[PDB]
Paper text:
To mitigate uncertainties stemming from potential mixtures of different peptides in our crystallized structure, we conducted pre-incubation of the [name] protein with an excess of synthetized peptide 5 before crystallization. This strategy facilitated the elucidation of the [name]:peptide 5 complex at 1.76 Å resolution. Four independent monomers were found in the asymmetric unit, all with a highly similar structure (rmsd value ranging from 0.14 to 0.21 Å for 574 Cα atoms among the four monomers, using monomer B as a reference throughout the text). In this complex, the amine N-terminus of peptide 5 is stabilized in a manner analogous to the description provided above for the other complexes, involving pockets P1, P2 and P3 from the OBP. It forms a salt-bridge with an aspartic residue (D507) and engages in hydrophobic interactions with a neighboring tryptophan residue (W504). The initial four residues of the peptide (AKTI) establish antiparallel β-sheet-like interactions, engaging the terminal residues of the extended strand of β20 on one side and forming parallel β-sheet-like interactions with a loop of domain I (which includes residues S54 and N56, from pockets P2 and P3, respectively), on the opposite side. The oligopeptide adopts an extended conformation with minimal intramolecular interactions, displaying a kink of ~90° at residue 6, resulting in an “L” shape. The two isoleucine residues in peptide 5 (I4 and I6) tightly pack against each other, occupying the two hydrophobic pockets P4 (involving residues Y486 and V502) and P6 (formed by residues D443 [aliphatic chain], S446, Y449, F481 and L482), all situated in [name]’s domain III. The lysine residue at position 2 (K2) of the oligopeptide is stabilized through a salt-bridge interaction with E524 and a H-bond with T528 (domain III, both residues located in P2) of [name]. [name] features an additional α helix in R1 (residues 523–530), a characteristic absent in AliB, AliC and AliD, which instead exhibit a four-residues-long 310 helix.
Author numbering:
A (entry chain E): 1 to 10
B (entry chain A): 33 to 659
The structure:
């Protein structure tokens, strides 16, 4: 799965 | 109320179609409403979901699932629509094939006949190895044994879809602002979607397993990173159930003292964050370069392995991590391999151990490399300069003029993404010299950034030289889930991490990725001996590490300071797939008071002891399913 790294909320 | 879960989401979904999307933003809005055959319990075991029982043939090629009876599809308003039956999984996989799912890599070579349906060589889906034997008996037939097959079933491409509903919605199906455009069979109903604002769920009060659902509502507020203090601020007000903390926040000393007894650190997650190298850049809408000579220079530099290794060795990962974690806890999150080093083990050797045994063939510089998480094994200024010296001589001999300019885009709303890329810039420039390499940070809006990274439509849209905007999480329990996606043919993912989508591109041949394909394919053919299969996948990871085509930096999640009102270790635990507690909130329990660090640490030590028990019990029980 692709995920965005701009915010690391966990 | 403790039963009102509140937190955040970071990107609006492009679609609600969970069968087609490979992006976490779709998982975030759908997993709580859509169950497949299995979920994960709080120890990480597969738990019966829509499948009440299962069996596998002696030769490992045929899996058969008994569908639990009385499981209903519901509208977003709680109207019963239809029974969930085996036909919904037949239709799910057919839809994934017809609409050309972004995640097809994990089914196309596994399910018998699917590759031929995908390409159109076979015209009838009845020739594909998924069958509704009857309404409550679902049978998959595979091309080879796959010990990790059942773990794929917690990923969304294997979720069911009611064909009647799908057809009735037509072109309005699964639209990303319309919760009425899906049906729900899971613990919650998706009730609201408002762009750049909120994602909303309510408890499915007719769910068969509602006894294990301990939240009445779920609300996710849009968070774009412009106000990182909002996470703790809304936790403390009681709005949020959880808060990831940023020790570089200007008010952090006050938070740390206030919650001294409550801040605890989570384990590093399984996904990889790092910087992809665009080996075939096409568009220059976001560049500081002004001449064609600069663009050719950068393109030749990125095809040079020594240049890429120079960037890889120049990155101070502790400093990078510290831009979101502060200096003290920065090391915890550092990662030196695309595949998490302990993702699998062969006997006593971790996957990282196997990679480290093979890497020194590529060069003495890899000798003694420490690939373990929690420490920077790759940062080495001397080796970075040595590698750049080799690259400088080769590139100067080809008429390249320095400095090499590298465009790195940033979402200008995410302050700590800018800070991370600023730390990459300072690393590369301080170690290699601005006379040699210049990192040009391209600031743009959130939507502009999404359209050249996360949601880029094609390789042409990958408007960057190096980018860390998109991570990768594993979809199932085998190294192929990390490594297959970088094969020259996996064009859905090669554009995102490597900037290309043409498998026969001259850039692709130049960097030797056809050799990587052969290593990956040779590992994939090992189904008899898991130890040998993992050794062979480690040969592919070894090539990838040496290639420096992706620069690993840190775990994409976890290894972070947090505050919580969630009862520790009540949530689903999942190393892979779409049923972990990051997106799926069954089992999870909430409490009144803030968890203390002592409460968390005690629960963790007790959980680790129970987990080893439960996991071994689960493994011993597998033989009971061979029929």
């Amino acid at each position: 799965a692709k995920t965005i790294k701009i915010t690391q909320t966990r | 109320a403790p039963k009102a879960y509140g937190y955040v989401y970071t990107a609006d979904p492009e679609t609600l179609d969970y069968l087609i999307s490979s992006k976490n933003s779709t998982t975030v809005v759908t997993s709580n409403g859509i169950d497949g055959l299995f979920t994960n319990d709080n120890y990480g075991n597969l738990a019966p979901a829509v499948a009440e029982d299962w069996e596998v043939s002696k030769d490992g090629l045929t899996y058969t699932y008994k569908i639990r009876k009385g499981v209903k599809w519901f509208t977003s308003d709680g109207e019963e629509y239809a029974e969930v039956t085996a036909k919904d999984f037949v239709n799910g996989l057919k839809h994934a094939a017809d609409k050309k799912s972004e995640a097809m890599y994990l089914a196309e070579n596994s399910v018998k006949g699917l590759a031929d349906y995908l390409s159109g060589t076979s015209t009838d889906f009845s020739t594909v190895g998924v069958k509704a034997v009857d309404d409550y008996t679902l049978q998959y037939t595979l091309n080879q044994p796959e010990p990790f097959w059942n773990s794929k079933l917690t990923y969304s491409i294997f979720w069911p879809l009611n064909e009647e509903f799908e057809t009735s919605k037509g072109s309005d199906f699964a639209k990303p602002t319309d919760p009425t455009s899906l049906l729900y069979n899971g613990p919650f109903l998706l009730k609201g979607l408002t762009a750049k604002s909120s994602v909303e769920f309510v408890k499915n009060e007719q769910y068969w397993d509602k006894e294990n659902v301990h939240l009445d509502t779920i609300n996710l507020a849009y968070y774009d990173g412009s106000d990182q203090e909002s996470l703790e601020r809304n936790f403390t007000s009681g709005a949020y159930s959880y808060a990831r903390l940023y020790p570089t926040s200007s008010n952090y000393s006050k938070v740390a003292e206030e919650y001294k007894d409550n801040i605890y650190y989570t384990q590093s997650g399984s996904g990889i964050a790092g910087l992809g190298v665009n080996i075939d850049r096409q568009s220059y809408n976001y560049t500081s370069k002004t001449t064609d000579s600069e663009k050719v220079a950068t393109k030749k530099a990125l095809l040079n392995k020594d240049f890429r290794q120079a960037l890889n060795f120049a990155l101070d990962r502790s400093a990078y991590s510290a831009q979101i974690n502060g200096k003290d806890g920065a090391a915890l999150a550092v990662r030196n391999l695309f595949v998490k080093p302990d993702f699998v083990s062969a006997g006593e050797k971790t996957f990282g151990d196997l990679v480290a045994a093979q890497l020194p063939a590529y060069g003495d510089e890899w000798k003694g490399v420490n690939l373990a998480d929690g420490q920077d094994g790759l940062f080495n200024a001397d080796k970075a300069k040595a590698e750049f010296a080799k690259a400088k001589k080769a590139l100067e001999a080809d008429g390249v003029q320095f400095p090499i300019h590298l465009d790195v885009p940033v979402d200008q709303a995410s302050k700590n993404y800018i800070s991370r890329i600023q730390s990459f810039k300072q690393s590369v420039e301080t170690v290699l010299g601005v006379e040699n390499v210049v990192v040009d940070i391209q600031q743009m809006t959130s939507d502009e950034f999404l359209n050249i990274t996360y949601y880029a439509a094609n390789a042409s849209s990958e408007d960057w030289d190096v980018s860390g905007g998109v991570s990768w999480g594993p979809d199932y329990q085998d190294p192929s889930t990390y490594l297959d996606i970088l094969k020259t043919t996996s064009s859905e993912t090669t554009k995102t991490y490597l900037g290309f989508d043409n498998p026969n591109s001259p850039s692709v041949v130049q960097v030797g990725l056809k050799e990587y394909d052969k290593l990956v394919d040779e590992a994939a053919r090992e189904t008899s001996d898991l130890n040998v299969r993992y050794e062979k996948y480690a040969a592919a990871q070894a090539w990838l590490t040496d290639s420096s085509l992706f620069i690993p930096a840190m775990a994409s999640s976890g290894a972070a300071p947090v505050l919580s009102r969630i009862v520790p270790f009540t949530g689903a635990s999942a190393q892979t797939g779409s049923k972990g507690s990051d997106v799926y909130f069954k089992y999870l329990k909430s409490q009144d008071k803030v968890v203390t660090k002592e409460e968390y640490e005690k629960a963790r030590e007790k959980w680790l002891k129970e987990k080893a028990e439960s996991n071994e019990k689960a493994q011993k029980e597998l033989a009971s399913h061979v029929k």
